[PDB]
Amino acid sequence: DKICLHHAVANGTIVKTLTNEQEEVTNATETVESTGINRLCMKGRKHKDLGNCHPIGMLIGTPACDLHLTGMWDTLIERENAIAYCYPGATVNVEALRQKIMESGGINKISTGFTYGSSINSAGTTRACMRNGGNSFYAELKWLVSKSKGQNFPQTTNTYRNTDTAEHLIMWGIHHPSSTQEKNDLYGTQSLSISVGSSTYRNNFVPVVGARPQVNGQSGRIDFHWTLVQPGDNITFSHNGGLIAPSRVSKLIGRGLGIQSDAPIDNNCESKCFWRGGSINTRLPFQNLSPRTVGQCPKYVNRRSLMLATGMRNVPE
């Protein structure tokens, strides 16, 4: 006449302990997600997919960036082969600036009220910039050239003036001609100089002629330079020509999440963590899909699977 006092199971996953690897247990759960949604989950977020628009292009007015030149966004998205430059060119401080845009939350644009002398033809256009079928140019930039071929470009001064509450990012361009024959045509024979100075900036640019390969079928280059114009502070442009003067001035408003990804949008699904391959959602505190991520996220770890025991030791008879 006796009384006896646990459960075991046919299959026990093995966890790791401080003394024992390979220790069978009645149930154990994964603490690392290794499967993540292929798509980007965008529920409950006001966002903007720039498509083949580069974030720099928004401020500059690249033709692909036309329906993006203003907006507001919780979230902003960038794509693999976005087009920043219509016309061959490089940007000074491009990475210092792209980040500024991808952590903003919208762009407002202001006209500069620039006004050019009757000596000056400001309707410059290139066939790098093809709006519908015609020669166009950057939406917020006027390519000044002297109106009569070869005739010397007049000394011109244009001053933007910030009267708004918050600082305005202002962008301008400098033109670098392909051949010395070409420089005289547009601006003239004179010694060129562009002097841009505000209260918290001074600089100066001098168009350089040189033999260069053809990019989008153009040899000449437009380098783009930008600065922030503080509230209550004017900025002055004095130029011989070769200035791609800003018709407009971008303003960056608020703060938003910036995603660089090739995954397609899905607004069915919710998330707060995105990477390149898309998105990751779970409450597992770890993850091994990708090391580089955006927004609130689980920390990256090397191991494919980590087993946390939810049960007692599994001992079959």
Binding site: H6, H7, E23, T31, G258, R292, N302, R303, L306, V315
Partner: protein, 166 residues
């Protein structure tokens, strides 16, 4: 560690599909049960759990390295070093956290078994002899007295003492 599991008790009851801890029943009348809040005293902490694990200490991060363009080479390497180091931390931290809270779980699963057991043998008092396989030899004759904390020890102190002594 505690003697109870993989100790004197020499396997589990794969037959049991209800509860971690139960009673195996033997007397002339009849022959398997389960003790209820020894196994939810246990579940309360197994589901004290993953509360630690899944509560999000979530700080929002931004992207310090662009994928779709050249990053300046010096700062590029500083970033790849800081992140390789922050990973080698969290991979450690994760590996310890599961391996230490596995070690804590596994060896707390008998504690309750032992406390159930020693509860029982304090109920039975001098009316029963241990037998050392976690079983109790009972030297007298609705045995859910012990299962449901009922059993009076003086009530059959009685003949059982002398069933031992014969």
């Amino acid at each position: 560690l505690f003697g109870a599991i993989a100790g004197f008790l020499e396997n589990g009851w794969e037959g049991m599909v209800d509860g971690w801890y139960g009673f195996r029943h033997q007397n002339a009348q009849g022959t398997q049960a389960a003790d209820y809040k020894s196994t939810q005293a246990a579940i309360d902490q197994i589901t004290g759990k993953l509360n630690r694990l899944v509560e999000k200490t979530n700080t929002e991060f931004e992207s310090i390295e662009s994928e779709f363009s050249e990053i300046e080479h010096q700062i590029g390497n500083v970033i790849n070093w800081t992140k390789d180091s922050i990973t080698d931390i969290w991979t450690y931290q994760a590996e310890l956290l599961v391996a230490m809270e596995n070690q804590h779980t596994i060896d707390m699963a008998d504690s309750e078994m032992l406390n159930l057991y020693e509860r029982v043998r304090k109920q039975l008092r001098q009316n029963a002899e241990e037998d050392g396989k976690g079983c109790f030899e009972i030297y007298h004759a609705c045995m859910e007295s012990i299962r449901n904390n009922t059993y009076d020890h003086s009530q059959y102190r009685e003949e059982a003492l002398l069933n031992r002594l014969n």
